[PDB]
Design a protein around this ligand. Structure first.
Ligand code: SAM
Ligand code: L0J
Ligand code: MG
Ligand code: MG
Ligand code: ZN
Ligand code: ZN
Ligand code: ZN
Length: 424
């Protein structure tokens, strides 16, 4: 009995709406990908199959796919068999979108009908072809030729593609339907297509949220929702100004956002507090920090972050979004490096900015608060840790739910912390 249904919206194409009233935290849909792959930065760092970090065993046929276990290498083999011959035939490694579309084609040609397409299929996806600028068309033509080069060993002619399959159109669909898969710690680790979930239109203040548990996607309501009300998710990172959202929503998704937040530049001024010269430099440095982070080089991430957070030169308020991103990278680097006191220093500083920039129930705040409460618990700060773990649970019961394994870990921390308070 589905609680959601496809419908034709007035000015946003197809959408998803509530069949019945929905309450915060209600599970609305869950889905494996139609196709997914590890991202360029996480390649060789996380398992190709389960998307969990580490050493990894390489496929000896292609030496590109890496796995956490024999179970994962063997289980991945059917969906890897055909791309394996392509990865071997090409030291060149394809763009993520090309490896993704390869797996789309193989799944559609060789796999049983996918539950991921239950409400909406890859064939159905929006392409926005009549909104593409010439520069985007040129980029898509390059992706098509990259695909044809990469796949030459396994796809020679059109009989090896789905009926009336057009590669240009397929990449156009990929551009505006790609989901950024994040691990439990909210690190981007992959990209996937989830065609049923692709029905959800975007809002900068959405009433639903998606969370990933490995490649598996949970869709949950994060607000009360009335019968027939349209379901929305935020396609974008919350730590973005309306100008940045405008550029991404145009470039990637070919639409102009009419929401209250965009009409009022909601929070932009707070996000850009501090000295423009300083945060412009921090924004520029974040390109390298995030690239270093995408490749899990935590020591180099921390060094760059410390040079900003404890700079001898002018500094930024923690509510400035570029400063805040630097604090988050520093916290995660310290966690992965075992520098738990320093991790807590940075994490605690993010708490009030996160409260402001992740209103309501957002999985990124839930995870962040959980990390801080876990750090406080390990340092013996039981009453402080309990408050944060309870807050993390209030959020993550809505954004993650019992179906997400991270909720089980949080429950164990709550139980450990409460036992400590009771023994105190
Ligand atoms: C993942 S699809 C969402 C479902 C889509 N409406 C469809 O018909 O298949 C993303 C595309 O939906 C449209 N879209 C999503 N959110 C929108 C919004 N808030 N306003 C206008 N168009 C939107 C844009 O065409 C965008 O590229
Ligand atoms: N570290 C970042 C964690 S995040 O939760 O903020 N995040 C940022 C937003 C991201 N969302 C998407 O990729 C996405 C794509 C779509 C439709 C298909 C176009 O809908 N959502 C998930 C990860
Ligand atoms: Mg269409
Ligand atoms: Mg259109
Ligand atoms: Zn694995
Ligand atoms: Zn291989
Ligand atoms: Zn908006």
């Amino acid at each position: 009995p589905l609680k959601v249904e496809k419908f034709a919206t007035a000015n946003r194409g197809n959408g998803l709406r509530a069949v019945t009233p929905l309450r915060p935290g209600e599970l609305l849909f869950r889905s494996d990908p139609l196709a997914y792959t590890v991202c360029k930065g996480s390649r060789g760092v996380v398992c190709d199959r389960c998307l969990l970090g580490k050493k990894l065993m390489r496929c000896s046929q292609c030496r590109v796919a890496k796995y956490c276990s024999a179970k994962c290498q063997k289980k991945a083999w059917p969906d890897h068999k055909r791309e394996c011959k392509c990865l071997k035939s090409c030291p060149r490694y394809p763009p993520d979108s090309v490896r993704l579309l390869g797996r789309v084609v193989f799944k559609l040609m060789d796999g049983a009908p996918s539950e991921s397409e239950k409400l909406y299929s890859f064939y159905d996806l929006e392409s926005n072809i009549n909104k593409l600028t010439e520069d985007k068309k040129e980029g898509l033509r390059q992706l098509v030729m990259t695909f044809q080069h990469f796949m030459r060993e396994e796809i020679q002619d059109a009989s090896q593609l789905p009926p009336a399959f057009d590669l240009f159109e397929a990449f156009a669909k990929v551009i505006c339907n790609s989901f950024t898969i994040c691990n439990a710690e909210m690190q981007e680790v992959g990209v996937g297509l989830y065609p049923s979930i692709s029905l959800l239109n975007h809002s900068c203040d959405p009433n639903c949220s998606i969370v990933f548990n490995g490649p598996h996607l949970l869709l949950r309501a994060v607000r009360d929702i009335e019968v027939g009300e349209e379901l929305t998710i935020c396609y974008l990172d919350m730590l973005m100004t309306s100008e940045e959202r405008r550029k991404q929503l145009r470039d990637q998704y070919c639409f102009e956002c009419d929401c209250f937040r965009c009409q009022t530049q909601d929070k932009d001024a707070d996000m850009l507090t501090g000295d423009e010269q300083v945060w412009k430099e921090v924004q520029e440095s974040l390109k390298k920090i995030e690239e270093l982070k995408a490749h899990w080089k935590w020591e180099q991430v921390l060094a760059m972050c410390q040079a900003i957070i404890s700079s001898n030169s002018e500094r930024l308020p923690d509510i400035n979004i570029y400063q805040l991103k630097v604090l988050d990278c520093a916290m995660d680097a310290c966690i992965n490096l075992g520098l738990l006191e320093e991790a807590l220093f940075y994490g605690t500083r993010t708490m009030e900015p996160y409260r402001i920039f992740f209103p309501g129930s957002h999985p990124v705040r839930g995870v962040q608060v959980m990390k801080v409460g876990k750090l406080q618990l390990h340092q013996g700060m039981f009453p402080q840790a309990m408050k944060n773990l309870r807050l993390a649970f209030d959020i993550m019961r809505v954004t993650h739910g019992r179906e997400h394994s991270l909720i089980e870990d949080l429950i164990l921390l709550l139980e450990e912390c409460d036992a400590n308070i009771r023994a105190s």
